[PDB]
Amino acid sequence: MLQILGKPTSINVRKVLWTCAELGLAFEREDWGAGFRPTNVPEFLALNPNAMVPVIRDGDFVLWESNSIIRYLAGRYGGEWLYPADARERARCDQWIDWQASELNRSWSYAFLALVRQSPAHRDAQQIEASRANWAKHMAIVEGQLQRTGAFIAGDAFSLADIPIALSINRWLETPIARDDLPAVDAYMTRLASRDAYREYCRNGTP
Ligand SMILES: N[C@@H](CCC(=O)N[C@@H](CS)C(=O)NCC(=O)O)C(=O)O
Numbered sequence: 001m002l003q004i005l006g007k008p009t010s011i012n013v014r015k016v017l018w019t020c021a022e023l024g025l026a027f028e029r030e031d032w033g034a035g036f037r038p039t040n041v042p043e044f045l046a047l048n049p050n051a052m053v054p055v056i057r058d059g060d061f062v063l064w065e066s067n068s069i070i071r072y073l074a075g076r077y078g079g080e081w082l083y084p085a086d087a088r089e090r091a092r093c094d095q096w097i098d099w100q101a102s103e104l105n106r107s108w109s110y111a112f113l114a115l116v117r118q119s120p121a122h123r124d125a126q127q128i129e130a131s132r133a134n135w136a137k138h139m140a141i142v143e144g145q146l147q148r149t150g151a152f153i154a155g156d157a158f159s160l161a162d163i164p165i166a167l168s169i170n171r172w173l174e175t176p177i178a179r180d181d182l183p184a185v186d187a188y189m190t191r192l193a194s195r196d197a198y199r200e201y202c203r204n205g206t207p
Contacts, residue, residue: 006053012066021197146184174207
C-alpha cells in the first residue's frame with residue numbers, strides 16, 4: 001500500500017491526500033513534521049534530505065516534493081482525466097501548479113508564520129504587512145483567471161491544478177488578515193464544495 005509520510009494539517013501533505021482520494025488510491029499515512037514526529041532524524045533524512053513532508057513510498061520508489069508527487073500519482077494511477085496527456089492541455093495545468101509553488105506559496109510566508117503559526121521568530125509588523133500585501137497581489141491574479149474561466153483554474157474541467165490552487169485559497173481565507181472581496185474566488189470555492197475530497201482535505205477548517 002502506498003505510504004504517505006506527513007502530518008495531515010500540512011498544506012503540501014493535503015495536496016497529496018486530496019490527489020489520492022480523487023484518483024481512487026488506497027494509502028496509509030504516518031504523522032511526520034513539526035508538532036507530530038520530528039523529521040530531522042537519520043531514518044527520515046535518508047528518504048528526504050530536506051527533512052520535510054510530504055514524502056511517499058510506493059513500493060521501492062521514494063519521492064518527495066508535493067507537486068512532483070501529485071503529478072506522479074496522476075500519471076501512475078489512471079489520472080489522465082485529472083492531468084491530461086495532451087501537451088497544451090497539460091501546460092495549462094502546469095502553469096498554475098508551478099506558479100502556486102514558485103510565487104504564491106512564497107508570498108505568504110511571513111504573514112502565515114506570524115499569524116497562524118504564531119512563530120516567536122516572526123513578530124515584525126512591517127514584514128507581516130509586506131507579506132500580506134504581496135500575497136494579496138498574487139490572489140488578485142487568481143481572481144483574474146477565475147473571472148476568465150468562470151469555472152476551474154485551468155479551464156472548464158476540474159484538473160490537477162485545482163488542488164494546489166484551492167488549498168492555497170483556503171489558506172488565504174483561514175489566515176486572520178483583512179482581505180479584499182474576490183467574488184470569482186468565492187464562487188470557485190463554492191463550486192468545489194460538491195467534491196467530497198475537497199471538503200475532506202481542503203475546506204476543512206485547517207489553514
Ligand atoms: N516544497 C516542499 C515544501 C514542503 C514543506 O515545506 N513542508 C512543511 C510542511 S507544509 C514541512 O515539512 N516543515 C518541516 C517540519 O514540519 O518539520 C513541498 O511542496 O513538498
